[PDB]
Design a protein around this ligand. Sequence first.
Ligand code: 63Z
Ligand code: NAG
Length: 345
Amino acid sequence: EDLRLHLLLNTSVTCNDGSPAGYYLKESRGSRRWLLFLEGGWYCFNRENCDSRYDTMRRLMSSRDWPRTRTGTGILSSQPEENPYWWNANMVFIPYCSSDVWSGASSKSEKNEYAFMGALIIQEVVRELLGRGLSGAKVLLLAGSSAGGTGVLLNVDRVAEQLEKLGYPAIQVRGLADSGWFLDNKQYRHPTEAIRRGIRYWNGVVPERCRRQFQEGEEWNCFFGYKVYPTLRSPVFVVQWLFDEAQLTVDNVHPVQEGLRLYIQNLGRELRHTLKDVPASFAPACLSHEIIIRSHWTDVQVKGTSLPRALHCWDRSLHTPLKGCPVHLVDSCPWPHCNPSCPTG
Ligand SMILES: OCc1cn(-c2ccc(Cl)c(C(F)(F)F)c2)nn1
Ligand SMILES: *[C@@H]1O[C@H](CO)[C@@H](O)[C@H](O)[C@H]1NC(C)=O
């Protein structure tokens, strides 16, 4: 229980229900590395389905019941045994309480039952951390899982621009997007519509270069990794199971026959294709969901390299490829669990 809760001092930056947003922090006095992690957990895109989420997922919509501390796990652990990559970093966990894939910039008001302020929560956390040590940082890694992974892609360049404009051009902003790289593909039995309605309901914002390509009405495109990633300037490491459970869910996939076998194999092939030109990526051939804040995140390997090792090699590459220190690790085998190191479940 080593990360301590701080509610935002700017109380106009709120969770869905108007309660203040916040962050959990464990400082590491010696370190100039900062890890800011965006929690995930789907989203809601109209009054009805947000009302339902408020009944049974209220911690994702409100800070009123948050605990005063959280234990850092996986990449947020301070133990080198659990976190070979960044155990000595300053650790920040940002709870997801905006239900907007971290894209929203809209307040609760007479016109809005809910506030959707995810993009502003990130900006405010960064602003308040600069007075707590972030001003002395050399690397700010914006990480995230699930909706938080997509949130990394939507916000990493805005964090970089924010620090540049505040007068901190020496902080290197990087992104780590875990399980947030989705395909706008055809369902197996009859995602783009959800995001389309979400953006209007949230007043959602997307990165500028991507917005300029797709333009008004088509900004939903920028929520899909393979479309937004080529527009980004900050270095982004992409972690994505080839057969992500959430992708299969939105594809309406739940003794597998030929049609479904071909569907699943084509999904893995398409995911692999979208990662071909992503130099820093870790994509195992597993049916699973999220990775980087679980305690046993060290166990999975691609081509004999673990994710903590891949991320360390990424660090080195950002100091020609490195001998025995790869950063591009995408499985080529075509079926869930053809990789023996996949999570057991
Ligand atoms: O916790 C599971 C989960 C999945 N998602 C998510 C994020 C972005 C997109 Cl773009 C999509 C989809 F389905 F639209 F592709 C889903 N968010 N949280
Ligand atoms: C507080 O947040 C709002 C955005 O919701 C912003 O307009 C305002 O300037 C902030 N001001 C502070 C913290 O001084």
